[model samples]
Target: SMFNSEIKEKYLDTLSEGMVMQMRPIFAKAEITETLYNKDIYDFTSMQILELIRSFDQTTIGSVRRTLALLSLYIDWAISYKLSKGLTNLARTISEEELYECLGDKKLYITYSELEEMENQLVNYQSKAVLRLLFEGVSGLAHSELLSLTKKQVEDAMLNGNVLTLYDSKHGERKLKVSSECLVIALNAAQETKYKLKNGKAKGQTKEVFLVENDYVVKTKRTSNKGDGQASKFVITNLITDISEFFKINFLTPNTIVRSGHLYRAYQLYKEKGVIDNSVRYQIIDDFNLRVKSKYRAVYSMQDYINEEEVNKYYAEELGL
Candidate 1:
């Protein structure tokens, strides 16, 4: 059995460069040990694993689960290699049930009231247009793919009649057809962009769509007080961090707001609404189920499957058609 330090070092060294860079801080603090790294850890029931992960003192279960996932991947690979060489007799692999359970049993759906509150907060921050664009873009685009957008990408979508080409996507570049309402939001954001440049808030030469202002003033006590200064620049990290902080302060919960993508739920809802064959303004619950499976390729959330039938029944009753 490898010592905790040695196992952790080996795991860190074996991770992809991108993952190592992203998770360096996490690996630095994790309490990996021989006991913690044992194959028996993976033998726990999904619920047991979930409880163990949740009981940690970490600020976010998302980060904890992400670290565990990487660790588990490495351990599994090691065990598999050992078994292949006739050095072990393990026959089964750990299921993703524990990771899924760690994400909580409830579906993280955005209600109209929550959406309104988010909109109000964004307006207060003078970034409502950007939030609007984000929502609209997510409704029509993949969550992983939409995060890579730039000013030029958004502008090209506007010029091309709500059709945007997504580059740097998992499935390569593809065209996404957005709604007119979404287009309006993008156009408004563009106008806001112009306003920022005119007001001298922006550099006027930068092309990034999301503009961040460094308004956080640090407090310090020293003879020189050199550390007591506000930030003087904006970057992508700042924008993403600010948005994450907004969610943390407003709508996030211990169980609900982990680092999982939230836009996929909205995509499922939109797909549900797009399956209408009649022009009678009817809500098609059956069509929703079919569309969800067709578009998402049977990738229903754990919560989606829990109360799926009841949800469909409720929607069908509401339609009364």
Candidate 2:
């Protein structure tokens, strides 16, 4: 196997088969392939390699940073092997210092309530990925699961028509089916959004899955207008700060507390979805400190049941939108 040859010839006793196998699929599915189709790995310059990582669609910045670290270990081997083969170093230039300094920090996994609230708030924002993030989180899979979907897997859902389901064979975590009951809702809603997002639609791409982006994903290659740089955008902290300012304007809370409602919002949504009331589910959700339940047995009268639109409208006002 290429994996065996690549590791044994270079890393030898240093690289374990299990570790090599773990990173295999990540490297194989790296989104940079779109830029490098049929191009030799040996031919890629360090700038191109860094740029490729910048353009990759890994689930999160943390994932990207970790993958780069893992990749460097392999590249260390590759460089040595190439040296042993009389080839000059192509990756002598993987210098992305600020990539770690700026990113590779703590990440916030938005909760379902936050997502549902933002879904309405995002009604005008139109990030389909943000819309689906809630559903993806609830699927009993790791956050990385959604990013791992290939275009063929997504197409298989569309072809199955109306019912979108997949029995994902989770490695070592138990076999789980990652199903979507509202696949059409997402596809139909995001169609025009994707159509308008870029220089053009991605050229009838294959092998890649379409996932929505809420913001420009950050990556580092040391490109510059002043000939070099730090990050170009908010590193979560700014986002949190901005949202906090908005929070002060919006929510009337005790002691003028200000923070994104965070998982508290998700707990609210879980109650609406009935998961919070289930004994086992409640235990799990409560442990995370996200439990919120309506004490009023509302819908005690027909007038008490506000229509869905009004409910969203009320929430929009609550969010100070």
| Best-matching candidate per lDDT | 1
Task: For residues 130-165, write the lDDT of model 2, one tens digit per residue.
Answer: 234224431212322232333344445656642333
Q: On residues 1-321, what C-alpha lDDT tens digit does candidate 1 reach at each position? A: 223455455666877898777545544433342246442333433344444444443332344446567645644755664522233322223233223233322334333233444555443222443344343333222333334444465677778987766543344565666556545554454334222221223445752333332221111112223342321123222333344453433333312321122223332453456332222111222222211334333333433422333233223323332
Would you list the C-alpha lDDT of every candidate in the order shown? 0.38, 0.35
Off by over 4 Å in 1: 1-107, 124-134, 137-144, 159-161, 188-321
The residue pairs in collision within model 2 are: 113-265, 113-266
lDDT at 50, model 2: 52
In model 2, which regions exceed 4 Å deviation?
Answer: 1-14, 31-47, 54-56, 83-321
Residue 31 miss distance in model 2 (angstroms): 8.4
